[PDB]
Amino acid sequence: GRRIQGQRRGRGTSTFRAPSHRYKADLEHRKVEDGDVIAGTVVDIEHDPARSAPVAAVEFEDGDRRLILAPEGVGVGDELQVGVSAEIAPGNTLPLAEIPEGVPVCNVESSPGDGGKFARASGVNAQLLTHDRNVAVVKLPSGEMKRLDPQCRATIGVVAGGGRTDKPFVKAGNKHHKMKARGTKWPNVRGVAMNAVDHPFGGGGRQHPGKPKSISRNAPPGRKVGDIASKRTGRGG
Amino acid sequence: PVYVDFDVPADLEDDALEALEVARDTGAVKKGTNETTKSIERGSAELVFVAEDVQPEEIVMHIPELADEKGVPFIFVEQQDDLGHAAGLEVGSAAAAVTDAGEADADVEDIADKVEELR
């Protein structure tokens, strides 16, 4: 047949690319030698095209102006700190080791110094649970217990923009506008609605997959469609 | 470095080169890894020198063990060009052998001793 859409994506053609030239900036934590004597002042609050959430422009002591992954409750004028000694308040960044247990955190690093990998989406947050000299246990937004290096840096508080998902798009035109700001091909044509040549579920008098949807993990690209290696399906049980 | 199992003091190295410098004006000396190698094999060698800055190292890796199973004493020199200059060459020399000293047998004798002691 013909390659399915999932395969067209990989080529990374314009239709499937993110409007990168239009994106503002990479929100990775600042790099500090040591000391924590790094403080800056929130100079402005801005909209981040890539995440549909606000971001804060900060001016640091040494003269470095950079956008930051802002938590809820940060405003112009406020002073932020980043370092091992940094104060324990919303908007500040410091290694988990220095963070008191039971404190909601965001933009958590996977590997100390990477700049932040976890909990960066609208109104989300990780929960620092256990401390140690060898392992900092964090509970991620998905509910998973992650064992991390206490040396991994993070930002106190939850990410700004919470609740974004609570309101419906109501109309296609709204989805449209959001989708245009992402690396995504939209709208979506169902497999069952295409010709046999275009998808494993195409063909047939009436629409219906002529096969079970739960596909094996070992399925090759082009065949791995439907419910991938589902451990189960439905709502029952 | 892989063939060097002990470090020789800058000063000890000093005495050896000098001894080698007079050894050529008086006695007899060999220049080159090959000629040095044959002397050790023929036994016609008293003391052999081996630079430590030889790239590739295979050119001299054999000198150490070959001398041991031949009783011939050997000593390391830091620079390759110094050994060549000491042997009176206008170029460098990876290895050198003092084939029968000359008005230096006294020192060469001590140098050998100082080395054995130096393990």
Partner: protein, 194 residues
């Protein structure tokens, strides 16, 4: 008596044992951080180089080249093929890696000509070979009684036509009798069945 050279040679008969083993473990670390073709002032295997025609003289260059280990890097047929011509994985190329190496080296030094080459080891994902190249335009070589032959016009780009030692072996030209019915005088002249 034995030459000093013989010792280098004897060491390389078992590059996995003795001092050489430790030298390779060290070197390869550096090599892995070098380019595809690195020119070097002195052959790693002196005996082999000299044996192949090397000489400490002007116009004689030596370069180490690394190449990816394994079989062919082939693309599956986009058009219809009978089971026979559908293979993709276990198919290997017809030139050995040493030959690929000699050619890359010669491309890097357009004005030089491949004289010979030899292996200097490999790790699990690549192989290294050192190549001796000669400057056919340098008088120090136009006058050498042992190398001036490589200055002739018909020796130009010799490596690209299989005139190398590795070239000739890989073309099945070793045997002078049985088994070389389709290799001599050339693969092409024998319809390409060798």
């Amino acid at each position: 008596a034995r030459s000093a050279y013989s010792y280098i040679r004897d060491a390389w008969e078992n590059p996995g044992d003795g001092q050489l083993a430790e030298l390779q473990w060290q070197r390869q670390q550096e090599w892995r951080n070098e380019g595809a073709v690195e020119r070097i002032e002195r052959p790693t295997r002196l005996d082999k180089a000299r044996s192949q025609g090397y000489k400490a003289k002007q116009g004689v260059i030596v370069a180490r080249v690394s190449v990816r280990k394994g079989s062919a890097r082939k693309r599956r047929h986009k058009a219809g093929r009978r089971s026979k011509r559908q293979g993709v994985t276990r198919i290997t190329r017809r030139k050995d890696i040493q030959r690929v190496a000699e050619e890359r080296a010669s491309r890097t030094f357009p004005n030089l000509r491949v004289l010979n080459s030899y292996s200097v080891g490999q790790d699990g994902r690549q192989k290294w070979h050192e190549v001796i190249l000669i400057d056919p335009n340098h008088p120090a070589i136009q006058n050498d009684d042992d190398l001036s032959w490589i200055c002739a016009d018909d020796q130009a780009d010799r490596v690209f036509r299989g005139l190398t030692g590795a070239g000739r072996r890989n073309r099945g030209l070793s045997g002078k009798g049985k088994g070389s019915e389709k290799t001599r005088p050339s693969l092409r002249s024998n319809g390409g069945k060798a």
